[PDB]
């Protein structure tokens, strides 16, 4: 699918849904997660608890509450197991899959989120983007980078 690399705060993103790297119990942690748990609302975490435990490498969908998007997509990268890079290729693929199921047109991932959590940073984005390019072009993927330096780190990795 199309991939754009900007910088900003993924909770100000206005498209269709956002993709939160998550632990497969869907208990929302600190960092960007908690920011989502905050700006989005309690309505999210309850939904994550309704769904309950899911497999690593799977993904689940919840509404976004008070976020400027429709859904939040929870891609499970660890929990019952440590985060492999196979686990990331799977979590990402499950993530993109669920977009297509809902017939979405704009989603956003957070560049190094829980996608690191003890993993080689450059190695992930490598295998993440790899899956994204396989997604249908009805989908426009945005990489919300924390640092504007980081945004160049997702432009040159595709500039080769």
Could you identify the residue written with the tokens 């199309």?
2
Give the whole-angstrom CA distance, residue 143 versus residue 6: 6
Decide: 6 and 144 in contact? Cβ < 8 Å: yes
Residue 90 domain boundaries: 1-160
Experimental method: X-ray
Return the closest-CA partner of residue 105 out of 9, 1, 30: 1
Q: Are 63 and 40 in contact (CB under 8 A)?
A: no
Helix (H) or strand (E) holding 8: none
Looking up residue 80, the CATH number of its domain turns out to be 3.40.220.10
Q: How many domains does the chain have?
A: 1
Q: What is the resolution of this structure in A?
A: 3.0
Query: Which has the closest alpha carbon to 15: 6, 25, 24?
Result: 6
Report the greatest alpha carbon distance in the chain: 44
Cα separation of 93 and 83, whole Å?
A: 15
- Sheet strands (E) in the chain: 2-7, 17-23, 59-63, 71-78, 106-110, 140-145
Distance CA 88, CA 34 (A): 21
């Amino acid at each position: 699918a199309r991939i754009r690399d900007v910088q900003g705060d993924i909770t100000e993103f206005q498209g269709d849904a956002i993709v939160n790297a998550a632990n497969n119990y869907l208990k929302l942690g600190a960092g960007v997660a908690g920011a989502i748990l905050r700006k989005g609302g309690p309505s999210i975490q309850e939904e994550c608890d309704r769904i309950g435990k899911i497999r690593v490498g799977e993904a689940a969908v919840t509404g976004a509450g008070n976020l400027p998007v429709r859904y939040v997509i929870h891609a499970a990268v660890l929990g019952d197991e440590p985060a492999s890079l196979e686990t990331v290729r799977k979590a990402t693929k499950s993530a993109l899959e669920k977009a297509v199921e809902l017939g979405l047109k704009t989603v956003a991932f957070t560049v190094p989120g829980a996608w690191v959590g003890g993993l080689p940073a450059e190695a992930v984005r490598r295998v993440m983007v790899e899956e994204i390019k396989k997604a249908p072009d009805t989908l426009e993927v945005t990489g919300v980078h924390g640092t504007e330096k980081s945004a160049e780190a997702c432009r040159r990795a595709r500039l080769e």
